[PDB]
Design a protein around this nucleic acid. Structure first.
Lengths: 121, 152, 48, 102, 430, 48, 98, 61, 156, 97, 50, 48, 129
RNA sequence: UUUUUUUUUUUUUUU
């Protein structure tokens, strides 16, 4: 687990680093956010996403991790290239350069609560 | 890297002057030969006539192209089709050091298709043997050879 | 002349003559194939 | 721990015995028709004891990544666990396998 | 700040609809990087590249004269056509289309003052003013409208539909408008979904795109399926011939010979399909008119080198191949190596003839001498801006993303005479 | 009536394996899966 | 007579196991056209052949009374093309295979 | 096609009788002869050409 | 009579010459020929209307009561005619392929209903009382796997 | 107007509308994500020895590109407001009773 | 008829094809055609008269 | 040895093929946390 | 017999050994030439023999009518090759109907009859050490 | 169809 202090430069290692994404969406969505979740999953597979994501009617956040260069494209896609209406984009934290990764597969957390408890809640 | 035949620099030197540089020489030679050694008409019609001056001219072109086939160093398959030699030459160079991400590796196939240079040689290849051979047997003739070299 | 962009240059009459032949061979092949289709090939009634 | 290396099955005496009968039947396949032809021409029905040990029906389905002789199909040629491991390792995608449909 | 960013995001949506058969923005960008790196790798050890280096040490720039041809241009190790040459070819080709205004408007129905002859554009301004002669706000005022337009339309019309006076037309028009409004009170998918409210437009057009529908209580069911689901493009030629004959009966002011027009009109429809013509059928052409970058007219000197270079662009583009990169005699690989490089593109590549436009007479119909040098004011809507032009803001955001792609902030180092340099710098986290 | 959504139903439950256009896949995978291990074990060893 | 023969038609069919793979072939075939010597290139007709599918069945974990099942879908794709008056055999056969 | 092939009344009837109605279509009026008794393509192709000539020898009688 | 010149002069030639045969303004106002299509369950239909007071033939030159011997089935494939008053004016031709006994009857109601609207836009509002234009795209649910032999048939 | 309509109005308009080469390409063709990488050759771009072989001027020379893009966006609006609108008129009138 | 004394007949021999044969790479690279396979490679079609 | 002129192996005149020293897209991509069988030479160990 | 054999996995103790001795031999023999010329050798050193006996074969076709030319594989080829050495040779009034022999107008016979960029590259090639 | 027929309907297809 050698840090970037060993010899990363602009020759060949400039595109050999990992990190975490930074995004926090907020605003109303069509139906219950089904369109946004489906669109994000298809694009995420092409970029070989590892982290997870959360989608809902209003709340939309998550933690996405991957390559330093791969995540750069997603920043522009999820800021202007949005078919739905977006109010504003927030940020929580970011970090570039880290040995190995935490997650292994891309998945979206969905509300699988039973319908019986929905009325009580 | 004690020896001078295994460093990163020498590998690149032989990967351009022998892979891409040699491929272009064969490509131009094949096209140039066809201009100076034309045929009576269509390639398909020339086999059904069994006429002289067509079997002879075609045979000469086959030997000239074979003698003018450079031997690739990095590639050991030794392909005979000029279209395939150029298509595969770029794949080896692109996979050496061209890409910068996982996605770029998967998009290598699309890069070759977008290039207009490779699209010109797609419609120029050898006729498969199983084109006229079945038809010849139908009429029941035992005096025709599909191969041009053997026919002469 | 009167040639469109994405269209076949061949005459329409030639296609109609050739198209009918293809439909005839397909019908004959299906009829003959169904006749020679039975379990245990080579078995015939009261043959032994 | 470490899932099995699916390319090389473990040792199994019963599994090897099934393949032994296949070779014997192939060489004796010609003799099987001769025995039926002579009886048919003469018009007499009789047994053929020699076909018991070299018969085609002696061989049955078996699992290649296994050694059990049950639960094997002609399409996959694998047991319940053989298909699960092969499909989950990422090997059937090239062969048109979409698990999305039920 | 918030309004400026919103316009940039909305503008990108219009450009996406113009590229139906193309990869997304995140796919084409990656491909360009591979092409740029491939050119450098292939041209690293070229004989020409090494020859120039040795000449500098020996203090001998040019021994006799220029070796290379005066038609090539390489930027960032990528092939690019002349920027100035494209404008001349595009303007000259599009200028001949507007020539029909003389025999359609300047001789039949003068639209007041159409423009000066050719100020800058002469392409879209003509249509904007000519189409502004038909206005309608209140149905009660429709009677007076027929008294100011009937006389002008009494020439280019069928004989049976020309004997009536202005008052006769008004009687039917007055009753027709009332029926449409009453019926407008599966019809909601083409009334509020397509119309774009502005709050500033006091009146709206009639009988243009979607105003002539809903005449009766009930409309056709299958009609809607051919506008939203998919527009039938195969019948483009059939409809055009069935409408053109109404104006031209072969015995009126129009010529008596018209047969080859239908065959050629079909090609224009197929060519526009790639641009995204099918998308405009479903969505009303309102977003493109409003949400679109704009700027000042071009201004440059037409040099002799650029004037002759534009001729080749109009030659190969007449057959359908409007791209110079796909043709030979442009690849730098064969130029720096001494391969079989020639200028036979006009005979070898241009083998397929075009027996519909012309055989060997392109400059005759398309006058290249026009515009060019003679080309050397703000619009009504373009003037109202916060200094920065709409196009300047759009490119500013795009440049900040492509240039800043990664653990990066590639900086400003020289801003003079257009030339500039870039480098690398570390980026700290927040 | 959904026509495209029900495509391939006829050749899923009312067709024989030997009387259909579907080709086997086990034959190709037999020689493909085995070769993968050969290149992995002998790959680094040959270079060393 | 052999010299009196002529290729009346050439029905070209494809069989792809993936959606993306089939789409790549269509684009590649189109690019090979619009480059022949004659003014109009050979433009074959399209004829889809549906999409056959297969999915066997198996009992589902062992030591169970058949309470659940797991299916394995194996879709397929097909495509057919038609040709008429193939004057140039080299410019058609090579393009289809390439 | 039988219609294109010019033959006498007696000869025309025998052509369809030997092959039977299975290899004859009453709609268009064409006869298809299929031969596949060999695994190889070349071997099978030559076989068809031999039987075809023999059929015409007996038809004209 | 200037109003009729603009209306009658535009229907002829020009955009769509098909709409040229009418039976006065009041009482029929129906087109000479019309077409309609209807889908219900695993079946299809194609009904065409033509002028004539003849009988009703479905296919293979047969009568109507043969396909639908039941009384309720025959009434469903003729309900729109009674409401519109075309009881004995226009002919009826029903062509179907597949389905069942009562499955094909429903497709005819949707097919014939879509034909009358095309022939007369005005004669479409009165047909909403009986819900003729309404269809049923939903189909039978699949048999779930497991122990249940049927969709929800339990066992001991 | 017989010799200026047969092959002038239905043919020449196609040439002006054939802008797919400049429209299909990306907005930033000469600049990509890897534009500041080692793509330029160090032996032919660093010392500035050559003059025509290479030219690193695509970072601030947007004036030429801005003018080129401006001329390609005006004709697009005309096609949608003249061609698409004209077709809709025939389609709508094809079902008028 | 004199082409083969062991098979006195008019037409027995055909022509050889130019179809590639053999394995691209395996333990049987140097196999080509079998002893019995070469006979049918130079004949129009196999028979059962021998 | 097929007669396809566009094939990549039909024109192979030798029994040796190049091996990629580095790969960024592993062919045997798992669908989860499961590893590839036969990729653990060293035996495991338990805390005991 | 052949259907049941297709089962189980193949043998594993018959794979090619990775021997370094055989690796060097393959590389050394990879750059071998191809001096086959099986077809060219047959045609070569044959035209001279026909030229020596040109007068002897000149009368062969005079006594043979066109209708007698039934064996084209031996006669048609001979006639075509003969005309290559002697383009002009009128034997008699009757001639081929452009079917069995197409002499054409622009044929090939035994008797025989770079740019600024490329030229500039050669001048500077052998000018640096 | 006033020298016309002489009749029940299925689970892929007229691309």
């Amino acid at each position: 687990t050698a840090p970037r202090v060993v010899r990363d430069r602009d020759e060949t290692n400039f595109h050999e680093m990992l990190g975490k994404f930074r995004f926090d969406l907020q605003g109303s969505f069509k139906e219950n956010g089904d369109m946004l979740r489906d669109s994000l999953l298809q694009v995420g597979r092409d970029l070989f996403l590892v982290g997870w994501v959360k989608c809902r009617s209003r709340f939309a956040t998550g933690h996405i991790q991957g390559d330093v260069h791969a995540l750069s494209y997603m920043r522009r896609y999820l800021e202007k290239h949005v078919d739905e209406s977006v109010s504003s984009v927030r940020f929580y934290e970011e970090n570039f350069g880290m040995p190995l990764l935490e997650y292994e597969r891309l998945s979206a957390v969905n509300d699988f609560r039973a319908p019986g408890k929905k009325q009580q809640h | 890297y004690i020896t001078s035949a295994n460093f990163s620099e020498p590998v690149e030197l032989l990967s351009l002057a022998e892979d891409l540089h040699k491929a272009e020489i064969y490509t131009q030679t094949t096209e140039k030969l066809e201009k100076q050694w034309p045929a009576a008409g269509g390639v398909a019609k020339g086999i059904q006539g069994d006429q002289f001056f067509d079997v002879m001219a075609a045979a000469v072109r086959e030997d000239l192209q074979d003698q003018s086939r450079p031997v690739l160093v990095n590639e050991l398959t030794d392909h005979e089709n000029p279209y395939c030699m150029k298509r595969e030459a770029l794949r080896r160079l692109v996979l050496h050091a061209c890409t910068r991400n996982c996605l770029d590796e998967t998009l290598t196939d699309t890069l070759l298709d977008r290039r207009a240079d490779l699209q010109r040689l797609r419609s120029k290849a050898r006729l498969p043997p199983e084109v006229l051979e079945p038809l010849a047997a139908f009429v029941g003739i035992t005096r025709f050879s599909f191969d041009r070299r053997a026919r002469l | 002349a009167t040639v469109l962009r994405g269209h076949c240059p061949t005459d329409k009459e030639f296609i109609r003559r050739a198209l009918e032949e293809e439909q005839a061979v397909e019908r004959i092949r299906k009829k003959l194939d169904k006749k020679q289709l039975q379990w245990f090939p080579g078995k015939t009634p009261w043959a032994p | 721990l470490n899932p099995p290396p699916i390319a090389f099955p473990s040792f199994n005496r019963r599994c090897q015995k099934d393949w032994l009968a296949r070779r014997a039947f192939a060489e004796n396949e010609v003799n099987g028709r001769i025995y039926k032809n002579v009886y048919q021409n003469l018009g007499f029905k009789g047994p053929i004891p020699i076909l018991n040990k070299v018969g085609q029906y002696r061989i049955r389905m078996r699992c290649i990544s296994g050694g059990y002789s049950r639960g094997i199909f002609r399409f996959t040629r694998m047991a319940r666990m053989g298909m699960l491991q092969l499909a989950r390792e990422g090997w059937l995608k090239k062969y048109g396998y979409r698990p999305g449909l039920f | 700040l918030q309004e400026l960013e919103s316009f940039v995001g909305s503008a990108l949506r219009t450009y996406r609809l113009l590229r139906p058969h193309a990869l997304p923005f995140y796919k084409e960008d990656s491909l360009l990087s591979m092409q740029s790196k491939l050119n450098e790798a292939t041209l690293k050890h070229s004989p020409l590249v090494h020859d120039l280096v040795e000449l500098k040490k020996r203090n001998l720039s040019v021994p006799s004269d220029l070796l290379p041809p005066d038609f090539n241009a390489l930027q960032f190790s990528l092939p690019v056509v002349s920027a100035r040459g494209f404008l001349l070819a595009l303007s000259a080709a599009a200028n001949s289309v507007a020539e029909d205004l003389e025999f359609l408007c300047r001789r039949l129905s003068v639209p007041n003052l159409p423009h000066p002859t050719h100020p800058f554009r002469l392409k879209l301004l003509l249509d904007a003013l000519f189409e502004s002669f038909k206005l309608r706000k209140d149905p009660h005022y429709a009677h007076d409208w027929a008294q100011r337009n009937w006389p002008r339309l009494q020439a280019a019309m069928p004989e049976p539909l020309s004997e009536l006076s202005a008052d006769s037309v008004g009687l039917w028009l007055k009753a027709h408008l009332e029926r449409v409004i009453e019926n407008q009170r599966d019809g909601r998918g083409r009334l509020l979904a397509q119309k774009f409210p502005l709050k500033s437009d006091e009146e709206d057009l009639y009988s243009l795109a979607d105003d002539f529908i809903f005449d009766h209580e009930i409309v056709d069911e299958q009609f809607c399926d051919e506008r939203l689901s998919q527009f039938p493009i195969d019948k483009a030629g059939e409809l055009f011939r069935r409408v053109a004959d109404f104006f031209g009966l072969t015995k009126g002011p129009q010529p008596a010979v018209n047969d080859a027009v239908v065959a050629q009109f079909q090609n224009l429809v197929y060519t526009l399909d790639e641009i995204g013509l099918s998308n405009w059928m479903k969505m009303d052409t309102r977003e493109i008119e409003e949400f679109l970058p704009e700027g000042d007219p071009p201004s440059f000197a037409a040099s002799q080198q650029d004037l002759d270079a534009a001729r080749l662009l109009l030659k190969a583009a007449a057959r359908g191949k409007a791209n110079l990169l796909d043709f030979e005699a442009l690849d730098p690989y064969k130029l720096l190596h001494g391969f079989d490089f020639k200028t036979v593109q006009e005979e070898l590549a241009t083998l397929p003839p075009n027996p519909f436009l012309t055989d060997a007479d392109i400059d005759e119909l398309f006058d290249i001498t026009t515009a060019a040098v003679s080309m050397n004011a703000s619009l009504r809507n373009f003037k109202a801006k916060f200094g920065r032009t709409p196009l300047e803001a759009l490119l500013d955001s795009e440049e900040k993303f492509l240039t800043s792609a990664g653990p990066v902030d590639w900086l400003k180092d020289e801003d003079e005479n257009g030339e500039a340099f870039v480098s690398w710098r570390w980026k700290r986290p927040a | 009536a959904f026509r495209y959504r029900r495509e391939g139903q006829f050749t899923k439950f009312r067709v024989h394996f030997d009387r259909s256009g579907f080709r086997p896949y086990i034959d190709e995978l037999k020689w493909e899966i085995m070769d993968w291990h050969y290149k992995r074990a002998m790959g680094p060893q040959m270079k060393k | 007579a052999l010299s009196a023969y002529s290729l009346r038609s050439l029905i070209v069919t494809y069989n792809s196991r993936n959606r993306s793979s089939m789409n790549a072939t269509i684009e590649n075939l189109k690019n090979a056209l619009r480059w022949t010597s004659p003014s109009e290139s050979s433009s074959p007709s399209s004829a889809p052949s549906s999409a056959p599918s297969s999915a066997p069945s198996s009992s589902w974990s062992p030591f169970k009374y058949k309470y659940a099942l797991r299916h394995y879908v194996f879709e397929d794709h097909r495509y057919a093309f038609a040709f008429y008056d193939v004057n140039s055999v080299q410019e058609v056969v090579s393009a289809a295979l390439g | 096609r039988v219609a294109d092939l010019k033959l006498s009344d007696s000869q025309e009837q025998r052509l369809l009788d030997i092959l039977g109605p299975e290899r004859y279509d009453e709609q268009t009026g064409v006869v298809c002869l299929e031969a596949d008794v060999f695994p190889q393509l070349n071997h099978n192709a030559a076989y068809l050409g031999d039987i075809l000539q023999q059929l015409m020898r007996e038809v004209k009688k | 009579s200037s109003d009729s010149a603009l209306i009658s002069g535009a229907i002829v030639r020009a955009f769509n010459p098909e709409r040229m045969k009418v039976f006065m303004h009041n009482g029929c106002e129906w087109l000479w020929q019309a077409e309609g299509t209807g889908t219900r369950k695993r079946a299809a239909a194609h009904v065409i209307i033509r002028r004539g007071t003849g009988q009703v033939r479905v296919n293979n030159d047969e009568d109507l009561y043969v396909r639908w011997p039941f009384y309720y089935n025959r009434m469903d494939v003729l309900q729109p005619f009674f409401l519109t008053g075309t009881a004995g004016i226009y002919d009826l031709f029903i062509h179907v392929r597949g389905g069942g006994s009562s499955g094909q009857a429903g497709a005819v109601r949707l097919a014939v209903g879509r034909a009358l609207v095309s022939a007369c836009p005005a004669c479409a509002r009165l047909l909403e009382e009986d819900m003729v234009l309404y269809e049923d795209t939903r189909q039978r649910m699949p048999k779930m796997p497991g122990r249940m032999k049927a969709r929800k048939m339990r066992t001991w | 107007p017989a010799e200026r309509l047969h092959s002038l109005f239905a043919r020449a308009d196609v040439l002006a509308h054939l802008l797919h080469s400049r429209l299909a390409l990306p907005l930033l063709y000469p600049l990509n994500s890897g534009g500041a990488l080692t793509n330029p050759l160090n032996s032919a771009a660093s010392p500035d020895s050559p003059a025509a072989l290479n030219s690193i001027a695509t970072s601030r020379w947007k004036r030429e590109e801005v003018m080129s893009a401006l001329a390609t966006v005006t004709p697009l609006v005309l096609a949608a407001t003249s061609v698409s609108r004209f077709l809709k008129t025939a389609h709508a009138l094809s079902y008028f009773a | 008829d004199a082409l083969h004394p062991h098979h006195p007949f008019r037409n027995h021999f055909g022509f050889e094809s130019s179809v590639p044969y053999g394995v691209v790479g395996s333990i049987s690279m140097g196999k080509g055609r079998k002893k019995i396979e070469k006979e049918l490679a130079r004949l129009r079609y196999p028979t059962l008269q021998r | 040895r097929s007669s396809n002129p566009f094939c990549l192996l039909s024109a192979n005149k030798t029994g040796w093929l190049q091996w990629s020293p580095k790969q960024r897209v592993p062919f045997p991509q798992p669908l989860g946390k499961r590893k590839v069988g036969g990729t653990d030479p060293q035996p495991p160990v338990f805390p005991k | 017999g052949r259907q049941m054999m297709k089962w189980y996995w193949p043998s594993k103790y018959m794979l090619q050994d990775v021997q370094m001795a055989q690796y060097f031999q393959m590389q050394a023999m990879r750059f071998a030439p191809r001096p086959a010329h099986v077809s060219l050798t047959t045609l070569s050193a044959t035209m001279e023999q026909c030229w020596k006996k040109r007068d002897a074969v000149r009368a062969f076709f005079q006594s043979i009518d066109e209708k007698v030319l039934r064996e084209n594989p031996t006669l048609q080829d001979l006639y075509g090759l003969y005309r290559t050495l002697c383009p002009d040779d009128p034997l008699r009034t009757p001639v081929d109907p452009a079917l069995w022999r197409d002499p054409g107008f622009t044929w090939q016979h035994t008797a025989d009859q770079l740019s600024a960029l490329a030229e500039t590259g050669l001048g500077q090639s052998a000018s640096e050490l």
